[PDB]
Amino acid sequence: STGSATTTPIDSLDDAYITPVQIGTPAQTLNLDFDTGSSDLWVFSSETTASEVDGQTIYTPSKSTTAKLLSGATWSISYGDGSSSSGDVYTDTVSVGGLTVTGQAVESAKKVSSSFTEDSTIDGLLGLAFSTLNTVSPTQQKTFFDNAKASLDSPVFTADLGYHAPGTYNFGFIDTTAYTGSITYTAVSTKQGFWEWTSTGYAVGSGTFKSTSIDGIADTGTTLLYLPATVVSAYWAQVSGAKSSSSVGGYVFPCSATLPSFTFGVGSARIVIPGDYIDFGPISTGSSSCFGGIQSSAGIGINIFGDVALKAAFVVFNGATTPTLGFASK
């Protein structure tokens, strides 16, 4: 089997991407944030505290003929941005882009933190990291990808995020029309439960390439590119008037600037992030200070190749018995 679904930015800055997911019988369509940095499929639901719901579409298990309470199971998750959610669990039929899994754990939120309530466009998360990070207790549950894998034509999924435009998630096949040149594959460590890999270095604009190992995760659920402070200082030193602002919470630059590109290595290959991708616009409405898309990973404890980096590439998440990542230009 295969599946193919379009993913759409939630706003004009590509702060996140939503993908429609069918849950239950008859289908309830929810728009979920597909997150390669986490392993829980959780939704806004009929069980969510009413004061914590503000415009989201909810899953109502009582209306699904295929829903079953996973008796005694609970979940609770905390993300890198300080957000959180928790609740109980149902099993139900879940379909993404025509690919169906029966008996998927659907984690129904009883509580969500303020950032989820305030984002009316995200109805929940669909985790695509390794199932070893799933938070269901006392019986850990499998991701949608892990449950689908055996049925797929090839044990892979691909992320093809758009810059200020829709893109695609495919399951079970690699669309050879979606990228240019060849795919370069690179080794993955699953020791922390992430799609963790080692970039071979970077360049700033037209500058020389610096060969240096940068361990990090491929994370579709993180907006920005978070890299070591050395690398990030080298990038922003090329933008007149750019600075790190403790008040704002990262590097800002004058909105009059033209930003340089940023190149990262994948083995002997190179992915170029255009400068425009690194512009996250005014820090507040009307400000002439703009927020940068490349930020320091210092204090976060891991480098993160988030959407700013991934949307420059066609990315293959190869879940064969030895997992690998693939990157192509597009």
From Swiss-Prot:
Coiled coil: none annotated. This is Endothiapepsin. GO terms for biological process: proteolysis. Belongs to the peptidase A1 family. Disulfide bonds join 255-290. It comes from the Eukaryota. It comes from Cryphonectria parasitica. Residues 17-328 form the Peptidase A1 domain. The chain holds residues 90 to 419 of 419 of the full protein. It catalyses: Hydrolysis of proteins with specificity similar to that of pepsin A, prefers hydrophobic residues at P1 and P1', but does not cleave 14-Ala-|-Leu-15 in the B chain of insulin or Z-Glu-Tyr. Clots milk. Its EC number is 3.4.23.22. The active site is at 35, 199. GO terms for molecular function: aspartic-type endopeptidase activity. Keywords: Aspartyl protease, Disulfide bond, Hydrolase, Protease, Signal, Zymogen.
